[PDB]
Amino acid sequence: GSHLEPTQLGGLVTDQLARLCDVARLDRTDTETYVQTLATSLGTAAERSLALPPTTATLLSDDHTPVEYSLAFLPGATPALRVLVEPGWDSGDLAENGRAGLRAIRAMADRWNFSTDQLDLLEDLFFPVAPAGPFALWCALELRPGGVPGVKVYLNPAARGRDRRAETLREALDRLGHRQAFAALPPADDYPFLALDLGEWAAPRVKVYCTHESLSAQEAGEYSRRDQTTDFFHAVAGTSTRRALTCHSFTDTVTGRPSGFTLHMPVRSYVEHDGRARDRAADVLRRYGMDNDALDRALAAVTPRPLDDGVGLVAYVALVHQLGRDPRVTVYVSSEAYAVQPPR
Ligand X SMILES: Cc1ccc2c(C[C@H](N)C(=O)O)c[nH]c2c1
Q: Which residue is nearest to ligand X (CB)?
A: 264
Contact letters for ligand X, residues 17-36 (x by CB under 6 A): --------------------
Minimum gap (Å) between residue 316 Cβ and ligand X: 4
Provide, rounded to whole angstroms, the least separation between the CB of residue 3 and ligand DST. Answer: 28
Chosen from ligand DST, ligand X, none, partner binding at 61 (C-beta under 5 to 8 Å by type):
ligand X
Binding partner at 316 among ligand X, ligand DST, none, C-beta below 5 to 8 Å by kind: ligand X
Region class of 131: left (phi > 0), else alpha (psi between -120 and 50), else beta: beta
Q: How far is the CB of 2 from ligand DST (least distance, A)?
A: 26
Shortest distance, CB of residue 83 to ligand X, whole angstroms? 11
Single residue of 30, 68, 291, 336 touching ligand X by CB under 6 A: 68
Comparison of 156 and 230: residue with beta carbon closer to ligand DST: 156
Residue ranges in contact with ligand DST by CB under 6 A: 70, 72, 82, 84, 138, 140, 152, 154, 193, 195, 207, 262, 320
Query: How far is CA 96 from its chain centroid?
Result: 22
Site mask for ligand X (CB under 6 A), range 232-271, x = bound: -------------x------------------x-------
Nearer of residues 4 and 108 to ligand DST, judged by Cβ: 108
How is 259-325 classified by DSSP, letter by letter?
SEEEEEE-GGGTSSSHHHHHHHHHHHHHHTT--HHHHHHHHHHH--S-GGG-B-SEEEEEEEEETTS
To ligand DST, the closest distance from the beta carbon of 140 in angstroms equals 4
Q: What's the rounded Cα separation, in Å, for the pair 246 and 262?
A: 6
Nearest to 56 by CA among 119, 138, 114: 138
Among 316, 321, 333, 337, binds ligand X (CB under 6 A): 316
Q: Which does 156 bind (CB under 5 to 8 A by kind): ligand X, ligand DST, none?
A: none
Which one, 194 or 318, has the nearer CB to ligand X?
Answer: 318
- Specify which residues 242 forms β-bridges with: 215
Closest CA to 340 of 302, 311, 307, 306: 311
Minimum CB–partner distance for residue 29 and ligand X (Å): 28
Which is nearest to 117 in space by CA: 193, 204, 181?
204
CB of 5 to ligand DST, least distance (A): 28
Of 31 and 262, nearer to ligand DST (C-beta) is 262
- The phi and psi torsions of 215 (rounded to 5 degrees) equal -80, 135
Give me the long-range contacts of 10-16 (CB less than 8 A, separation at least 24).
10/38, 10/39, 10/42, 10/45, 10/46, 10/47, 10/48, 12/50, 12/335, 12/337, 13/38, 13/42, 13/65, 13/67, 13/335, 13/337, 14/38, 14/39, 14/46, 16/69, 16/301, 16/302, 16/303, 16/335
Decide whether 4 or 60 has the Cβ nearer to ligand DST: 60
CB of 315 to ligand X, least distance (A): 6
- Amino acid (one-letter) located at 138: W
- How many residues at the interface with ligand X, by CB under 6 A? 10
User: Closest Cα to residue 322, out of 210, 215, 205, 236?
Assistant: 205
In the complex with ligand DST, the residue whose CB is nearer, 4 or 331, is 331
Window of 31-39, 60-68, 120-128, 304-312 that interacts with ligand X by CB under 6 A: 60-68
- What is the phi/psi pair of residue 301, to 5°? -65, -35
Report the interface residues with ligand X, using CB under 6 A.
Answer: 59-61, 68, 84, 245, 264, 316, 318, 332
